[PDB]
Design an enzyme around this catalytic site. Structure first.
Site, mmCIF file in Angstrom:
data_model
loop_
_atom_site.group_PDB
_atom_site.id
_atom_site.type_symbol
_atom_site.label_atom_id
_atom_site.label_comp_id
_atom_site.label_asym_id
_atom_site.label_seq_id
_atom_site.Cartn_x
_atom_site.Cartn_y
_atom_site.Cartn_z
ATOM 1 N N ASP A 351 0.744 -1.305 -0.096
ATOM 2 C CA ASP A 351 0.011 0.058 0.057
ATOM 3 C C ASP A 351 0.922 1.242 -0.116
ATOM 4 O OD1 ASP A 351 -2.254 1.277 0.077
ATOM 5 O OD2 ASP A 351 -1.971 2.008 2.150
ATOM 6 N N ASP A 703 -1.955 -0.747 5.727
ATOM 7 C CA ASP A 703 -2.557 -0.153 7.051
ATOM 8 C C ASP A 703 -4.143 0.051 7.156
ATOM 9 O OD1 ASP A 703 -2.835 3.384 6.103
ATOM 10 O OD2 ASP A 703 -2.777 1.638 5.001
ATOM 11 N N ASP A 707 -6.944 -3.206 2.496
ATOM 12 C CA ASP A 707 -5.754 -4.035 2.249
ATOM 13 C C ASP A 707 -5.770 -5.508 2.910
ATOM 14 O OD1 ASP A 707 -3.557 -2.530 1.086
ATOM 15 O OD2 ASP A 707 -3.062 -1.534 3.010
HETATM 16 N N1 LIG Z 1 -13.410 9.847 3.057
HETATM 17 C C1 LIG Z 1 -13.362 10.130 1.504
HETATM 18 N N2 LIG Z 1 -14.262 10.807 1.046
HETATM 19 C C2 LIG Z 1 -14.546 11.010 -0.315
HETATM 20 N N3 LIG Z 1 -13.043 10.782 -1.237
HETATM 21 C C3 LIG Z 1 -12.271 10.286 -0.623
HETATM 22 C C4 LIG Z 1 -12.216 9.754 0.910
HETATM 23 N N4 LIG Z 1 -10.934 9.287 1.215
HETATM 24 C C5 LIG Z 1 -10.329 8.884 -0.173
HETATM 25 N N5 LIG Z 1 -10.823 9.598 -1.339
HETATM 26 C C6 LIG Z 1 -10.625 9.574 -2.715
HETATM 27 O O1 LIG Z 1 -10.599 8.117 -2.886
HETATM 28 C C7 LIG Z 1 -9.667 7.882 -3.607
HETATM 29 C C8 LIG Z 1 -8.819 6.365 -3.405
HETATM 30 O O2 LIG Z 1 -8.939 6.138 -1.881
HETATM 31 P P1 LIG Z 1 -8.344 4.557 -1.437
HETATM 32 O O3 LIG Z 1 -8.245 3.552 -2.678
HETATM 33 O O4 LIG Z 1 -9.144 4.202 -0.281
HETATM 34 O O5 LIG Z 1 -6.862 4.758 -0.691
HETATM 35 P P2 LIG Z 1 -5.870 6.231 -1.384
HETATM 36 N N6 LIG Z 1 -4.193 5.558 -1.410
HETATM 37 O O6 LIG Z 1 -6.186 6.175 -2.947
HETATM 38 O O7 LIG Z 1 -5.987 7.073 -0.512
HETATM 39 C C9 LIG Z 1 -8.281 8.662 -2.961
HETATM 40 O O8 LIG Z 1 -7.089 8.688 -3.760
HETATM 41 C C10 LIG Z 1 -9.192 9.907 -2.790
HETATM 42 O O9 LIG Z 1 -8.942 10.831 -3.470
HETATM 43 CA CA LIG Z 2 -3.654 3.285 3.195
#
Ligand SMILES: Nc1ncnc2c1ncn2[C@@H]1O[C@H](COP(=O)(O)OP(N)(=O)O)[C@@H](O)[C@H]1O
Ligand SMILES: [Ca+2]
Ligand SMILES: [Ca+2]
Ligand SMILES: [Ca+2]
Ligand SMILES: [K+]
Length: 994
Positions: A351, A703, A707
């Site tokens: 990750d 984390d 994952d």
């Molecule tokens: N709590 C949230 N609410 C809305 N959008 C969100 C969010 N937290 C993450 N995002 C968007 O979702 C995308 C993908 O999230 P995720 O695959 O879970 O992990 P990550 N490394 O991409 O952050 C992120 O890159 C982010 O731009």
């Molecule tokens: Ca993460």
């Protein structure tokens, strides 16, 4: 303590006397503690009886030496002679080594249990509660929570107590409770009561059991029971060795000693046969029994001799030792194999966000629309200051401190950040710092609005506690959050349905505020807010936005970017079905773009370095993140995964790009690619699975709940100390340090334990084979015996014990982390090693005979039976077959025999100096590398001296001897073992293969 989960929320709320939204009063807390004690379990003590640990018997090759002692205790009971003692020593030359190993094992295991409980009981488990003394949610040591008070928990959290759900924030709440009910998949919950006061846990679908994990959503509840009164607190004691079995290397050696029972048992029954012609010889008189019991005694004793009775202990030991070392590097090992398995790992998947990076996020750049006129678009960019989640810092346009509420765009922007947000802040008084509560990405936002302060709220006069959420709260008073469409990793966005606050005006405009990954959100925007204005989204507008996003993403700051948009005209609540999370994306369409935030998220210090070491250790490191592919690639570079300049189009894919490939092409893609982006949890799993389809040992680091699957599917999952409980639950190792380095040290250790196991096996085999080469050479060359029953038990007790077990504490080979990893299905013993086992044992077998021989011949204080042995031994009666019958019965002299026993010990204590390293010369890996080894040797050499000079003792064994010369001889014979190996190591070195 409530006995009810069958009551309503109110009944329960009123039961303790709490405001569902405010929480227990400082005086209610002081009281419930006194009446209910802390939320914990007594336990914490003895995980194994001092005696239990002793059961380092019960194993395989230990029961053998265990029984061999019984028989030598019965034979000594039926032994009549004026020599009624050399038979009682026997049972104590066998028990003795067994005991010695037992102690070390036991000692090593105790130290490990401790070291662990140290790491564990280090970082206190925290809880989220609503309490009267604070408006916003606060974090308290879970140990402190008591029945009655209001607890908040969300996706990835561990349920801290037994809880009655009051309000389910997300459209759905999904909990994993395998640890309890045993239900394999996550289950659903509701806030409705369940009448039946008898019902089983599985049915209490309005409760959250302390120790379960929230798999999805978020909720608030009221604590029913704490401590022992817990559903999981009662069942603790109750049995079941649900603690696994032996590790694959433990099962590998277990089987190696099993079929060494065969080879040995045979070579034994063999000796009993190859002789038994000496069943009549004058020695044991000539009885029709006193000759087969003696040689039966020589077999058993040869057995005890050859059998690596220390093998079952030394693994156990190296294991507990490796554990104790990781524990010291702040690594928790949850599953014994992990360190070994880790040792032979080829691929390390990881990750990005929070695992590869610090997860300490701050908004430091943002922008809205300025002007839109035809093909021209312009943005209002802003800069923020303050790296931490502290609500201290300022917004800046053109290096000038601006008042956010001056720009209408920034107002909505903030509004959205505040409203579309499940996280909050909390100021830690003790540590004196602002701490997040919920996801960092969200919290960064929260902080942003405290800095924006768009409604120019009076804050300067507010406690470090109140100042944390002040602004956000303002915004919160300005709209009513009807419901929320929880952030989902497929659509990659999140929304919130809001109405006008005071209800001052109904239907004056309901809203949905949206926040998500830019690409997807922007595609769902039909309009672009310009201040208070709105105009159609056009080609040029979009391009402008996306391009600044691209800039910030790949920039020297590698900004983590989120987009905020509002839907000005949402569907009516009645048209919105919240049952299927799948229809949410549509509910988030026809949007109006508002603005974009750039988040800072620093890679961890030790990461680039660890990556290198992996590269040298022949270990592939792959990034699997949900984040934007541009940002991701940017970061790989900064991490060393990719060179600062390097075409990666062939080795970096988005989940979408990846899924576009044919299955075949997917499999291969994994082999070359080192960066997977904007990938869902399933993808993370699939990518590992692929790596696994190359019969490789794959490691997964992360984390977050996205994952778990991959964490779980890999051979070893390594979770962050910072990361989710969910993630930890699916791990073998947990880096509490959050230190990435440890992973590598962890692989170095499993590389080592293996190497250690090898050398142990090498010493035991090549030596104990020499010991049998001794016998099957004299008794076949027609020579007088070289050792007696208790003489074998001694070379045993003194060279099959602590000198061997000590190899366990060999240092790492000098090249250990410089060669590719070992295939897991590799032949335990290579062909070339069996040769080296033999070439050593052979030379040990012969140098031990030629010594007894030499005493007969060239020993100036012995006879002079010169070459030929004068042919034979058949010279019983006076002047028998008169071939120079000048001597009588020197064929019973204890001297030719102690001569050999003395060499055996010495030549063995010599090629154990050869078991410092597989193929390294003592010129590179000298004896002082292992001190534990040296003390053992001296220990043994000393035991041998005692035996030879404490007069009562040479009787029970054999006549003393050696003053210079006689010893210098033993030395002249034994020492060359070291020369032979050091050439043999030269061979496999200046011709390599491993
Ligand atoms: N709590 C949230 N609410 C809305 N959008 C969100 C969010 N937290 C993450 N995002 C968007 O979702 C995308 C993908 O999230 P995720 O695959 O879970 O992990 P990550 N490394 O991409 O952050 C992120 O890159 C982010 O731009
Ligand atoms: Ca993460
Ligand atoms: Ca042995
Ligand atoms: Ca031995
Ligand atoms: K696993």
């Amino acid at each position: 303590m409530e006995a009810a989960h069958s009551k309503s929320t109110e009944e329960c709320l009123a039961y303790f006397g709490v405001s569902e939204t405010t929480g227990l009063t400082p005086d209610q807390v002081k009281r419930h503690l006194e009446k209910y004690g802390h939320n914990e379990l007594p336990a914490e003590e003895g995980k194994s009886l001092w005696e239990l640990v002793i059961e380092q018997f019960e194993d395989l090759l230990v029961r053998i030496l265990l029984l061999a002692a019984c028989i030598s205790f019965v034979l000594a009971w039926f032994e009549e002679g004026e020599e009624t003692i050399t038979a009682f020593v026997e049972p104590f030359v066998i028990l003795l080594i067994l005991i010695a190993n037992a102690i070390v094992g036991v000692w090593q295991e105790r130290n490990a249990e401790n070291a662990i409980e140290a790491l564990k009981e280090y970082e206190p488990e925290m809880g989220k509660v609503y309490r009267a003394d604070r408006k916003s949610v606060q974090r308290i040591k879970a140990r402190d929570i008591v029945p009655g008070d209001i607890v908040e928990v969300a996706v990835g959290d561990k349920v801290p107590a037994d809880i009655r759900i009051l309000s389910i924030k997300s459209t759905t709440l999904r909990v994993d409770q395998s640890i309890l009910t045993g239900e394999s998949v996550s289950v659903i919950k509701h806030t409705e009561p369940v009448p039946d006061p008898r019902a089983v846990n599985q049915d209490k679908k309005n409760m959250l059991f302390s120790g379960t994990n929230i798999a999805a959503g978020k909720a608030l509840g009221i604590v029913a029971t704490t401590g022992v009164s817990t559903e999981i607190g009662k069942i603790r004691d109750q049995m079941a060795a649900t603690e696994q079995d032996k590790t694959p290397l433990q099962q590998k050696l277990d089987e190696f000693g099993e079929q060494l029972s065969k080879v040995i048992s045979l070579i034994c029954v063999a000796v009993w046969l190859i002789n038994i012609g000496h069943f009549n010889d004058p020695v044991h008189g000539g009885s029709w029994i006193r000759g087969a019991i003696y040689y039966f005694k020589i077999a058993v004793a040869l057995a005890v001799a050859a059998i690596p009775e220390g093998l079952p202990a030394v693994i156990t030991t190296c294991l507990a030792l490796g554990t104790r070392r990781m524990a010291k590097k702040n690594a928790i090992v949850r599953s014994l194999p992990s360190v070994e398995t880790l040792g032979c790992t080829s691929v390390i998947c990881s990750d990005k966000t929070g695992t590869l990076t610090t997860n300490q996020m701050s908004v430091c750049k943002m922008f809205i629309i300025d002007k839109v006129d035809g093909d021209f678009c312009s943005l209002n960019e802003f800069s923020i200051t303050g790296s931490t989640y502290a609500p201290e810092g300022e917004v800046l346009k053109n290096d000038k401190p601006i008042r956010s509420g001056q720009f209408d765009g920034l107002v909505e922007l903030a509004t959205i950040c505040a409203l579309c947000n499940d996280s909050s802040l909390d100021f830690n008084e003790t540590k004196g710092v602002y701490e997040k509560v919920g996801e960092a990405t969200e919290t960064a936002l929260t902080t942003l609005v405290e800095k924006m302060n768009v409604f120019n709220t009076e804050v300067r006069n507010l406690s470090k506690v109140e100042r944390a959420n002040a602004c956000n709260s303002v915004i919160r008073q300005l709209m009513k959050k009807e419901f929320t469409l929880e952030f989902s990793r497929d659509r990659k966005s999140m929304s919130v349905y809001c109405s006008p606050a005071k209800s001052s005006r109904a239907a004056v405009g309901n809203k949905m505020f949206v926040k998500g990954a830019p690409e997807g959100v922007i595609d769902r925007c039909n309009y672009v807010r310009v201040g208070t204005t709105r105009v159609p989204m056009t080609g040029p507008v979009k391009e402008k936005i996306l391009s600044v996003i691209k800039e910030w993403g790949t920039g020297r700051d590698t900004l983590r970017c989120l987009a905020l948009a509002t839907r000005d005209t949402p569907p009516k609540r009645e048209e919105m079905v919240l049952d299927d999370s799948s229809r949410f994306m549509e509910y988030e369409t026809d949007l109006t773009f508002v603005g974009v935030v750039g988040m800072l998220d620093p890679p961890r210090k030790e990461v680039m370095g660890s990556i290198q070491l992996c590269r040298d250790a022949g270990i592939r490191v792959i990034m699997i993140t949900g984040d934007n592919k541009g940002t991701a690639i940017a970061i790989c570079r900064r991490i060393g995964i990719f060179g600062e300049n390097e075409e990666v189009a062939d080795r970096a894919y988005t989940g979408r790009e990846f899924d576009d490939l044919p299955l075949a092409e997917q499999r291969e893609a994994c082999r070359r690619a080192c960066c997977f982006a904007r990938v869902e949890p399933s993808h993370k799993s699939k990518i590992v699975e692929y790596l696994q389809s190359y019969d490789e040992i794959t490691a997964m680091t992360g984390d977050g709940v996205n994952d778990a699957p991959a964490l779980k599917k890999a051979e070893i999952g390594i979770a962050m100390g910072s990361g989710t409980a969910v993630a930890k639950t699916a791990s073998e190792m947990v880096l509490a340090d959050d230190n990435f380095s440890t992973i590598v040290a962890a692989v170095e250790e499993g590389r080592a334990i293996y190497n250690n196991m090898k050398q142990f096996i090498r010493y035991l085999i090549s030596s104990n084979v020499g010991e049998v080469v001794c016998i099957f050479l004299t008794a076949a060359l027609g020579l007088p015996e070289a050792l007696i029953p208790v003489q074998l038990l001694w070379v045993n007790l003194v060279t099959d014990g602590l000198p061997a077990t000590a190899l366990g504490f060999n240092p790492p080979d000098l090249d250990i982390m410089d060669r590719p990893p070992r295939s897991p299905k590799e032949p335990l013993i290579s062909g070339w090693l069996f040769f080296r086992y033999m070439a050593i044992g052979g030379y040990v077998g012969a140098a031990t005979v030629g010594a007894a021989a030499w005493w007969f011949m060239y020993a100036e204080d012995g006879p002079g039976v010169t070459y030929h042995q004068l042919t034979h031994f058949m010279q019983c009666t006076e002047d028998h077959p008169h071939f120079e019958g000048l001597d009588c019965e020197i064929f019973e002299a204890p001297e030719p025999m102690t001569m050999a026993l003395s060499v055996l010990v010495t030549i063995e204590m010599c090629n154990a100096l050869n078991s410092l390293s597989e193929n390294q010369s003592l010129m590179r890996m000298p004896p002082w590398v292992n001190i534990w080894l040296l003390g053992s040797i001296c220990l043994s050499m000393s035991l041998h001296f005692l035996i030879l000079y404490v007069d009562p003792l040479p009787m029970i064994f054999k006549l003393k001897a050696l003053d210079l010369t006689q010893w210098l001889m033993v030395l002249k014979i034994s020492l060359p073992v070291i020369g032979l190996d050091e050439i043999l190591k030269f061979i496999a070195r200046n011709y390599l293969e491993g």
